[PDB]
Design a protein around this ligand. Structure first.
Ligand code: 5OU
Length: 127
């Protein structure tokens, strides 16, 4: 089953801002998760063809991945840190919806999420 167009990483008519919190989300939260040993399946949109997951986009109607989030952060797509945090939460939730508890990909998601919650705990107050 085939791949949809990926989520946008630009949108000229969407409002956006730069904040120290969004910068922390790029410099710290994304960079740290990206370098983890379990990050690779989350670094790009799910390719349902290559991975032989033909049901994926029958079940996941709001897909999200850290490649997308990385480009959104780099391109100043967001209005505030909350919009970005939702994207990470969408990514994790999709994983938990599509797969079974304790599947390898779910353990990977859980490790990344643990780390995510740790880094978000030190999100600086908006300056
Ligand atoms: C997080 C999106 N994603 C990327 N690859 C995935 C998935 C997924 O949700 N379920 C999957 O089954 N696979 C394939 C897969 C399965 C196990 C491992 Cl260790 C890696 C990828």
């Amino acid at each position: 089953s085939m791949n949809p167009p990926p989520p946008e990483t630009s949108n000229p008519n969407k409002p956006k801002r730069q904040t120290n919190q969004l910068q922390y989300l790029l410099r710290v939260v994304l960079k740290t998760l990206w370098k983890h040993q379990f990050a690779w399946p989350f670094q790009q949109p799910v390719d349902a063809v290559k991975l032989n997951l033909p049901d994926y986009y029958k079940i996941i109607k709001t897909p999200m991945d850290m490649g997308t989030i990385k480009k959104r952060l780099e391109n100043n797509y967001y209005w505030n840190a909350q919009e970005c945090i939702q994207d990470f939460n969408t990514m994790f939730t999709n994983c938990y919806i599509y797969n079974k508890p304790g599947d390898d990909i779910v353990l990977m998601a859980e490790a990344l999420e643990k780390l995510f919650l740790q880094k978000i705990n030190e999100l600086p107050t908006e300056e």
